[PDB]
Amino acid sequence: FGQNFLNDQFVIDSIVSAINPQKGQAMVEIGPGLAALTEPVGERLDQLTVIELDRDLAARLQTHPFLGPKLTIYQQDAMTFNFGELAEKMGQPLRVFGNLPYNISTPLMFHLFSYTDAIADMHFMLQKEVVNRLVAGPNSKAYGRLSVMAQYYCNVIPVLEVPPSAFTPPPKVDSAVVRLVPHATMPHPVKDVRVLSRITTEAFNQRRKTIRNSLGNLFSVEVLTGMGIDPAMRAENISVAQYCQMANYLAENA
Amino acid sequence: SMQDPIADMLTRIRNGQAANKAAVTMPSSKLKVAIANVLKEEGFIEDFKVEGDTKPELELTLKYFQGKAVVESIQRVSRPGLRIYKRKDELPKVMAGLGIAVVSTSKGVMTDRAARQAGLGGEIICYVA
Amino acid sequence: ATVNQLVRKPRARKVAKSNVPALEACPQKRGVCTRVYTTTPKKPNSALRKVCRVRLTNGFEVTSYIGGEGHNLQEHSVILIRGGRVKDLPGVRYHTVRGALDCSGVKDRKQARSKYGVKRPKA
RNA sequence: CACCGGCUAACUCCGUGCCAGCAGCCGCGGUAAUACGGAGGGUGCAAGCGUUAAUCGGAAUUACUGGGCGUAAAGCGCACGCAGGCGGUUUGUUAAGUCAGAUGUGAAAUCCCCGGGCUCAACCUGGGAACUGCAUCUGAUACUGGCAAGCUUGAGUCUCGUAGAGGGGGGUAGAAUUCCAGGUGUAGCGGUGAAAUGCGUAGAGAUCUGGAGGAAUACCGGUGGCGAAGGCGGCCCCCUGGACGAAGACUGACGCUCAGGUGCGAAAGCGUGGGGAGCAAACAGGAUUACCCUGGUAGUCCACGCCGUAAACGAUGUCGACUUGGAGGUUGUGCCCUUGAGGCGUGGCUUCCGGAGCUAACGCGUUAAGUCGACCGCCUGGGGAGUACGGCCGCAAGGUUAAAACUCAAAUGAAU
A58 DSSP assignment = H
Q: Distance, angstroms, CA C83 to C1' D35?
A: 23
Strand D atom within 7 Å of C50 CB: yes
Instruction: From the options 3.30.1490.10, 1.10.390.10, 3.30.2010.10, 3.40.50.720, give the CATH code of B74-128.
Output: 3.30.1490.10
As for how many domains chain C has, the answer is 1
Q: Give the pairing type, strands B23-27 and B57-61.
A: antiparallel
Radius of gyration (C-alpha) of chain A in whole angstroms? 21
Of A168, A186, A204, the position where a domain reaches its end is A186
CA pair distance A79, C114, nearest whole angstrom = 76
Radius of gyration (C-alpha) of chain C in whole angstroms? 20
Experiment type: cryo-EM
As for how many domains chain A has, the answer is 2
- Do A69 and A175 fall into the same domain? yes
**DSSP track, A216-247:** TTT--HHHHHHTT--TTSBGGG--HHHHHHHH
Q: Which residues are within 8 A (CB) of A80 and not within 5 positions of it... i.e. 6 or more apart? A: none
- Do A109 and A214 fall into the same domain? no
Of A136, A156, A186, the position where a domain reaches its end is A186
What's C48's domain CATH number?
A: 2.40.50.140
CA pair distance A105, A99, nearest whole angstrom = 9
According to CATH, what is the number of the domain B5-61?
3.30.1370.30
- Do A149 and A203 fall into the same domain? no
For B4, B5, B78, B123, the CA distances from B1, given in Å and listed in that order, are 9, 11, 19, 24
User: H/E/C letters for each residue in chain B?
Assistant: CCCCHHHHHHHHHHHHHHCCCCEEEEECCHHHHHHHHHHHHCCCCCEEEEECCCCCEEEEECCECCCCECCCCEEECCECCECCEECHHHCCCCHHHCCEEEEEECCEEEEHHHHHHHCCCEEEEEEEC
Taking a C-beta distance cutoff of 8 angstroms, is the pair C96, C52 a contact? yes
Strand-pairing partners, residue C38, are C50
Instruction: Please count the other Cβ atoms lying within 10 Å of the Cβ belonging to residue B7.
Output: 14
- Do A169 and A132 fall into the same domain? yes
CA pair distance C23, B15, nearest whole angstrom = 63
- Do A63 and A181 fall into the same domain? yes
- Do A100 and A200 fall into the same domain? no
- Do A34 and A133 fall into the same domain? yes
- Do A215 and A98 fall into the same domain? no
Q: Tell whether C4 lies on the interface with B, counting CB pairs under 8 A.
A: yes
- Do A145 and A120 fall into the same domain? yes
Range of the domain at A83: 1-186
- Do A19 and A136 fall into the same domain? yes
Q: Pinpoint the residues of chain B covered by CATH 3.30.1490.10.
A: 74-128
Range of the domain at C15: 1-123
Chain D positions within 7 A of any protein Cβ atom are 1-3, 18-29, 37-39, 49-56, 62-64, 67-69, 85-91, 97-101, 139-144, 151-154, 255-256, 269-273, 281-284, 289-290, 297-298, 319-324, 356, 370-381, 395-398, 405-408
User: Resolution to 1 decimal, in Å?
Assistant: 2.8
Write out the H or E segment, with its range, that includes residue A134: helix A128-135
Taking a C-beta distance cutoff of 8 angstroms, is the pair A164, A11 a contact? no
Radius of gyration (C-alpha) of chain B in whole angstroms? 15
- Do A76 and A133 fall into the same domain? yes
CA pair distance B76, B69, nearest whole angstrom = 19
Taking a C-beta distance cutoff of 8 angstroms, is the pair B104, B123 a contact? yes
Of A166, A186, A206, the position where a domain reaches its end is A186
For A149, A185, B74, the CA distances from A195, given in Å and listed in that order, are 12, 20, 89
- Do A173 and A235 fall into the same domain? no
